Amino acid sequence: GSQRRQRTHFTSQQLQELEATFQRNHYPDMSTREEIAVWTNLTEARVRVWFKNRRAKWRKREEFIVTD
Hints:
It contains three helices and no strands. The chain is mainly α. Helix 2 (about 30-35) crosses helix 3 (about 45-60). It comes from Homo sapiens (Human). This is Pituitary homeobox 2.
């Protein structure tokens, strides 16, 4: 098949809830991936793919580092 809308698997609003919930949860699971997807019109696979790409991008950006 193919996509019903011209989107890069996310919207400019969904990406904000993903990078916000990434602050409270750095490693979501089947239950927590669904918890964020449920009110953002996503599925757990979109969340898993996004967090996988975000960890790979975080390491170039150094968005969080432990200072202790």
